[PDB]
From a paper:
To obtain these crystal structures, the crystal structure of the selenomethionine (SeMet)-labeled wild-type Cas12i1 ternary complex was solved using the single-wavelength anomalous diffraction method. Next, the SeMet-labeled model was used to solve the crystal structures of two unlabeled ternary complexes using the molecular replacement method. In the pre-cleavage R-loop complex, the two strands of target DNA are unwound beyond the PAM duplex and the TD strand forms a 19-bp heteroduplex with the crRNA guide region. The NTD strand extends from the PAM duplex and is partially exposed to the surrounding solvent. The nucleotides dT(4*)–dA(6*) of the NTD strand are disordered and invisible due to the flexibility, and the nucleotides dA(7*)–dG(20*) pass through the channel formed by the Helical-I, Helical-II, RuvC, and Nuc domains. The structure of the pre-cleavage R-loop complex displays how the NTD strand is accommodated within the RuvC active site. Side chains of three catalytic residues D647 (virtual modeling of A647D), E894, and D1074 in the RuvC domain point toward the phosphate group between the nucleotides dG(15*) and dC(16*), implying this position as the possible cutting site in the NTD strand.
Cas12i is a newly identified member of the functionally diverse type V CRISPR-Cas effectors. Among them, Cas12i is characterized by a relatively smaller size (1033-1093aa) compared with Cas12a. Cas12i has substantially different efficiencies in cutting two strands of target DNA, which results in a nicking activity that could be utilized to develop a double-nicking approach for genome editing with high specificity. In Cas12i1, the REC lobe consists of the Helical-I domain and the PAM-interacting (PI) domain, whereas the NUC lobe comprises the Wedge (WED), Helical-II, RuvC, and Nuc domains.
Residue numbers in the entry: 7 to 826, 834 to 1091
Write the structure that this text describes.
RNA sequence: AUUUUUGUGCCCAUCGUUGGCACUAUUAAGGAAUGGAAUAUAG
DNA sequence: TGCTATATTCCATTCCTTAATAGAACTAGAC
DNA sequence: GTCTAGTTCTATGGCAAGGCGCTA
């Protein structure tokens, strides 16, 4: 029901005097230095846990007792860390020696887990526990007693309480509530309710609870039974009855009884520690005197990875077990026959070192079609040996063999256009053994080998200490606050300064490390974004109300661009170039205050202060909870479709619609509202450039840059192509260079492709690497049109940074290639050319920031659109595509490289977070299957309706590639891709509609095909033919779903020619649409 | 408690007219891929 | 018109997932 | 009277394809 996230604001610390920053420095170093003591100590505690302690415990999520013991007795940690190493073969033996019993299957899978043998090892935490006992001189009896209470207090085990809590109950010396009194009270309430099981009013319940505590009021009840702490839910009933807010609430007595009965265990004992005094004295010797807030904040940072890895490794072991059980070990014998390939004459290789076989080695299941073809050739060669061939069968057999070989080579080449190329020799070998293993067992055997290697490599998570950070705030932490805006105003008035300024002060209680006592101290921060959105005061009387969503942002309805006074403008203009952007925002903010345009922000004690000290830098973060209540009564669905090269798209669908444009969709009345592209327009003068699609200036305007490129490449003309049986053909790069140097080609295309040419050049002049240095600098770093200075967020721009990366890589690789002492490292590269190494790093950092910006700007458009729709219609459900498992070893690495820049996941995760801050927005991801081929609002209403995608182009620009593609669609050969059939319908409808036959496309000269199309189009007075093409820009939709669609007669039916992606966004919106209103 | 010069970043043949924008921080591991040099193979 | 293919080693990278942190409500006692 | 510094709180579809571009 309730929803929570945080919004953080980064800030810059504005230091005070050396000596005051030294004091905070010292405190932060004290907390950091103490944290590993708590880590080591809790790891010792875990190692003491045992059957007796965990007996009859919840044990949730199907984790067995062995697993729970194992995860606490044994952990994979860095080799050089303090606990003692243990060998993997020993784990079961030690477990039995500590348990009394052999480890079950869960603990068994834990111990078999893969890990990096050179970084980490298993560690024996039980030995760590023994060392606690010996060093602190605790009895096993005493420690075990404390350990058991700690277990029931959730200080250890699988579901820990908060550090603040654990610290308090273990270490605090405040007055405790008497637990026996609460046991008596809880037991009595149970009794009285068992004696009256059929009450139905809270009134009745309240009176029974009071009777149980022998009291007239809530106040007396609390004082006697639950003096200190948050109010237990059973006393809450009474409180709320006196307040009169729970009168017409239901009473479910069996629950009440059950809940009370559950809490009883924790009140059977008083929490009288036997060992805590010694453990505190040890702690005081290492981290200094006990204080709740400091010990708590140190413990926080130690517990996080200890409990985190327990949760994660437990889940991981369980998954491993499921995954081993999906492995069909009954297929091992088939594996071995396939794996026999390596012992065969078809693969023989020096050192005879073999590798793991995978489905893509035989081309997935397509081997079945290859076997069908090979078997047809064989059967037909058999009768050709009986009747056709008589005595001279020495030439017919040789013919069979060549035909077998050819059918295979053809198969691998076919497969290898859209995937990794299957291994000729492995398929030759496998066909030699047709009699030993059936084709569906070749697949199952290969699958067995691949899946078994995959599951058995999965790595356990090692337990690594945290780099800590410490939290200050209002409640249950180290004490701190942001000076409230009103207190800011008061403070400045008292010191006789300006009402307002641009800095943010915190007051935090900190330990003076010299006195080891607490002192409150003020520190200064700066963050313009915090100023704008939160802190800067609306002082003007009668300001606009605080906004529904709290922060003062454009997305929340505050443009924050007021008309500046003359002096304000001149402050901007006179500010140093490095400070002008910040001052402009300050000015715009200050104007908005003066002109009563700045809305209120409702201050609370809602911001946590997080401090991370790295060297002498302090990183201070301010973060606040943002609360939301879901609103499932949706009025609009906003589909979103993610693309790589083209633009992302959205589509809005009104649900429960009425009036004009309504469509009946399986009894639900719906209406298309709109569809669109996601663009991020940035204005330079009167022009505007779409960050997401701009591919750079035409080379028209770049001739000096390109001439300067040309001038260089001429000096390194020479290359020599692949030795195709010792040919050594000449290679001029200028033929390639001139292909890209047109006035119509874009800067980013030119730069990218030039990187690839320079790369190749370098490979042909490996001893002359150093000479490319300066022109690499010019291209990437220094030039006015270099990669670092000009680049959009377009796909091509990201491919630019990638190829630049690769070029630098080529450079270093050839520069440091030995004439022919270990491999070349980043240490080595940086020393050989710091500037170039630094350039690799600046390219890396520039790319990350571009990626981050993209995610943020795309997400903003989606959320802005959704908010806009919410304001007109009511609640919006945003639906994106569930994208996973994109990059696979079975695909060509060029395909994987192309898919890597997709960012659908990163964009979607950002929408997720942003949505959590707005009433009336929800985000789900849906199955994207057939999303690009469905006829929206016709598909599933009621018939399945799928159609191909279409390219549109003039006859001049038809390529061989297009003609070939259209012919592949008219091919009779079946496929297991269900979309194939759509393209085949498309190609058939293509012929009919332009009055062609297969014979007019098939075989005839490309040029003649262009002519044939030209004659047909000209007679029809059309500029452009549509043809079916995978990935095509256009879709022939029934409804007009692209505001700019034109109509067409296609095979005697009328469709709108829509952008294929605007169509996809509506389909994404429609996926299981009926479920979002059931 | 006063620093008054900065929260992080994004775009451009014109880097400014107030140029135009956007944004949850951190810690750690794991998962799947990618680039470069070279080796071994079959083409 | 051509973007050779598989597999491995070593040095490097990016995109994403999943374990965590960024406590609430309270009161006795100190101002 | 406000606030600090301590305590205790917590609640009852099987697969596998599909979803992604080239420039020129």
């Amino acid at each position: 029901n309730a929803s929570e996230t945080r919004k953080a604001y980064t800030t810059k610390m504005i230091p005070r005097s050396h000596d005051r920053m030294k004091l905070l420095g010292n405190f932060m170093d004290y907390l950091m230095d103490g944290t590993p003591i708590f880590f080591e100590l809790w790891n010792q505690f875990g190692g003491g846990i045992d059957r007796d302690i965990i007996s009859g415990t919840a044990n949730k999520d199907k984790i067995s007792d062995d697993l729970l013991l194992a995860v606490n007795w044994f952990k994979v940690m860095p080799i050089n860390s303090k606990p003692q190493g243990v060998s993997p073969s020993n784990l079961a033996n030690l477990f039995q020696q500590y348990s009394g019993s052999e480890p079950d299957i869960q603990a068994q899978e834990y111990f078999a887990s893969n890990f990096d043998t050179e970084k980490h090892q298993w560690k024996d935490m039980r030995v760590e526990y023994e060392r606690l006992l010996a060093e602190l001189q605790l009895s096993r009896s005493d420690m075990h007693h404390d350990l058991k209470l700690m277990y029931k207090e959730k200080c250890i085990g699988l579901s820990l309480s908060t550090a603040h809590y654990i610290t308090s109950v273990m270490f605090g010396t405040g007055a405790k509530n008497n637990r026996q009194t609460k046991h008596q009270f809880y037991s009595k309430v149970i009794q009285l309710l068992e004696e009256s099981t059929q009450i139905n009013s809270v009134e009745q319940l309240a009176s029974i609870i009071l009777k149980a505590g022998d009291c007239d009021s809530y106040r007396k009840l609390r004082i006697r039974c639950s003096r200190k702490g948050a109010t237990p839910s059973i006393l809450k009933i009474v409180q709320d009855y006196e307040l009169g807010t729970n009168h017409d609430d239901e009473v479910n007595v069996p629950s009440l009884i059950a809940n009370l009965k559950e809490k009883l265990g924790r009140f059977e004992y008083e929490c009288e520690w036997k060992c805590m005094e010694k453990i505190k004295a040890f702690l005081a010797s290492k981290v200094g005197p006990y204080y709740l807030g400091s010990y708590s904040a140190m413990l926080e940072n130690a517990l996080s990875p200890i409990k985190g890895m327990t949760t994660k490794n437990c889940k991981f072991v369980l998954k491993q077990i499921d995954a081993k059980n999906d492995i069909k070990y009954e297929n091992e014998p088939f594996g071995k026959i396939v794996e026999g390939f390596f012992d065969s004459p078809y693969f023989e290789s020096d050192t005879n070192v073999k590798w793991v076989l995978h489905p893509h080695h035989i081309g997935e299941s397509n081997i079945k079609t290859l076997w069908e073809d090979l078997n047809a050739i064989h059967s037909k060669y058999e009768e050709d040996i009986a009747s056709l061939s008589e005595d001279k069968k020495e030439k017919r057999i040789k013919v069979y063999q060549g035909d077998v070989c050819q059918t295979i080579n053809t198969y691998c080449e076919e497969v290898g256009k859209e995937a990794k190329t299957p291994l000729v020799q492995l398929l030759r070998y496998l066909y030699s053994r047709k009699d030993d293993i059936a084709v569906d067992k070749i697949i199952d055997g290969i699958t067995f080998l691949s899946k078994k290697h995959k599951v058995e490599k999965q790595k356990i998570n090692p337990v690594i200490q945290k780099y800590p950070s410490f939290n200050f705030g209002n409640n249950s932490k180290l004490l701190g606050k942001i000076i409230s805006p009103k207190d800011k105003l008061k403070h400045n008035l008292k010191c006789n300064r300006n009402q307002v300024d641009n800095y943010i002060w915190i007051e935090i209680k900190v330990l003076n490390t010299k006195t080891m006592r607490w002192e409150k101290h003020h520190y200064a921060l700066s963050s313009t974004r915090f100023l704008e959105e939160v802190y800067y005061p609306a002082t003007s009387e009668n300001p606009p109300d605080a906004l529904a969503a709290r922060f003062r942002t454009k997305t929340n309805g505050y443009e924050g661009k007021p008309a500046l006074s003359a002096e304000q403008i001149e402050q901007i203009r006179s500010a140093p170039v490095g400070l002008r952007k910040v001052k402009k925002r300050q000015m715009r903010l200050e104007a908005a205050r003066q002109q009563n345009l700045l809305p209120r922000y409702t201050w609370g004690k809602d911001f946590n202060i997080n401090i991370c000290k790295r060297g002498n830098n302090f990183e201070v973060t301010l973060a606040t909870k943002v609360k939301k209540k879901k609103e499932k009564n949706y009025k609009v669905v906003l589909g979103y479709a993610a693309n790589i090269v083209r633009k992302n798209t959205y589509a809005a669908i009104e649900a429960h619609a009425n009036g004009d444009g309504v469509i009946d969709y399986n009894d639900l009345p719906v209406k298309p509202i709109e569809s669109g592209f996601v663009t991020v327009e940035s204005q330079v003068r009167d022009k505007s450039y779409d960050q997401l699609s701009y591919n750079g200036v035409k080379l028209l305007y770049c001739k000096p840059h390109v001439e300067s490129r040309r001038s260089f490449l001429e000096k390194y003309r020479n290359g020599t192509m692949k030795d195709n049986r010792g040919n050594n053909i000449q290679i001029d790069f200028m033929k390639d260079f001139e292909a890209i140097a047109d006035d119509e080609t874009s800067l980013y295309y030119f730069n990218m492709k030039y990187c690839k040419l320079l790369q190749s050049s370098i490979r042909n002049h490996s001893s002359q690497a150093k000479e490319y240095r300066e022109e690499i600098f010019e291209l990437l770093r220094d030039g006015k049109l270099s990669v670092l200075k000009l680049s959009s967020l377009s796909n091509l721009s990201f491919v630019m940074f990638k190829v630049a990366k690769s070029l630098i890589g080529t450079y270093f690789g050839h520069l440091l290639k030995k004439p022919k002492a270990p491999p070349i490292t980043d240490e080595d590269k940086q020393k050989a050319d710091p500037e170039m190494f630094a350039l690799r790093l600046a390219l890396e950092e520039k790319r990350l920031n571009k990626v981050k910006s993209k995610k943020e700007v795309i997400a903003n458009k989606i959320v802005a659109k959704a908010l806009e729709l919410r304001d007109k219609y009511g609640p919006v459900l945003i639906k994106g595509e569930n994208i996973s498992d994109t990059t696979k070893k079975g695909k060509k690495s060029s395909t994987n490289s192309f898919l890597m820049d997709w960012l659908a996941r990163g964009v979607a995760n950002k929408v997720k977070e942003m949505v959590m801050m707005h009433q009336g927005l929800e985000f789900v991801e849906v199955n994207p299957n057939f999303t690009s081929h469905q006829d929206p609002f016709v598909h599933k209403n009621p018939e399945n309706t799928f159609r191909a995608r279409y390219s549109r182009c003039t006859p001049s620009e038809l390529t061989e590639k297009n003609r070939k593609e259209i012919l592949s669609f008219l091919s009779d050969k079946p496929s297991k891709r269900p979309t194939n059939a759509y393209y085949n319908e498309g190609a058939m409808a293509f012929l009919a509609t332009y009055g062609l036959k297969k014979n007019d496309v098939l075989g005839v000269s490309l040029e003649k095909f262009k002519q044939i199309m030209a004659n047909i189009l000209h007679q029809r007075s059309e500029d452009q033919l549509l043809f079916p093409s995978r990935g095509g820009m256009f879709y022939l939709a029934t409804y007009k779903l692209d505001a700019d669609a034109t109509s067409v007669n296609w095979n005697g039916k009328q469709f709108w020619v829509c952008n294929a992606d605007l169509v996809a966004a509506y389909n994404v919106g429609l996926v299981d649409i009926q479920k979002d209103f059931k």
